[PDB]
Design a protein around this ligand. Sequence first.
Ligand SMILES: Cc1nc2ccc(S(=O)(=O)N3CCC4(CC3)CC(NCc3ccc(-c5ccccc5)c(Cl)c3)C4)cc2s1
Length: 329
Amino acid sequence: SGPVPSRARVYTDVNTHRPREYWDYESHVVEWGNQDDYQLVRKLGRGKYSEVFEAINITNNEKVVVKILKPVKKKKIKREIKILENLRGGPNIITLADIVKDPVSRTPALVFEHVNNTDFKQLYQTLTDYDIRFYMYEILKALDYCHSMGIMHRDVKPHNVMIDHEHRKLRLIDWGLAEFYHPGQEYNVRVASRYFKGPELLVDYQMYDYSLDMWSLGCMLASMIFRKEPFFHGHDNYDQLVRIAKVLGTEDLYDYIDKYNIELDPRFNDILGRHSRKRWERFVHSENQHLVSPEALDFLDKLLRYDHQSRLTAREAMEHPYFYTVVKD
Ligand SMILES: Cc1nc2ccc(S(=O)(=O)N3CCC4(CC3)CC(NCc3ccc(-c5ccccc5)c(Cl)c3)C4)cc2s1
């Protein structure tokens, strides 16, 4: 008789209490600026949904970032715009400045605040345990905020975190996969990058919530403290769950599937096998030891849980001992 339903343990009804317009993005009419206000300077990157440029607003000579969209359905563009507008001003959320159209290419372009992104090399060689805790706390502020505002990012990963290290500035970007949380709603599981997908996605449990983001965050944390990117390295979606199971163990996985009456693909029945839960100590070595503490491992353990309901919330995570020194500042 099908899967057991689930509700977010926090911020469950935040959208129900808002005016319809807040979440009903299909109804949104896009406010369009003047394309001619921006001159493109240089290409910064390409990202499947878009090409990203540094530009200048010739109205006031401010440096800006332009994300020119590849073709996507108008509803998905409206969704991303509405979410960016709802979250604008929130802690560490990228600021959408403007929205334009090339009136010949009909391509829509989002115009953002400029953040300088310090080079991976000069940063990932020169981080420190404190820095990781600090930036993780900054990400948690953005996640608690967006969750509190009824939105799930659904694509938390290093690529979507900008850091300007010189200014100790962090921004969560790429809100193109984010969605409003509504109690009872069945979502598309085919989101997020393979390595960061929650067990709920991999077993096709659609009634998920903000807690998805907390799994992804745990994946990020593991990759940083252990110096292993990606941490869970699956070869496809099936093997991705196997890689998780080889660490978290199969007993808890099967407990989760039982609790929610989830129907596993019969393919999985072959490849999952039986796996012990591993101690985190097997990923520690001389090179990463300076990043790993009892507190880090306790925190990580409490993010990486099959059962979405048992993961730390963003606000609980922020209260964890791993962050006591950062909070003191
Ligand atoms: C509104 C927009 N403006 C821009 C500007 C540039 C571009 S981009 O395409 O040129 N590009 C810049 C580089 C990145 C990809 C995007 C973001 C980087 N993060 C890696 C990272 C992330 C996090 C950490 C970290 C994590 C935890 C603790 C400490 C550090 C650490 Cl150590 C590293 C890679 C896209 C956009 S969208």
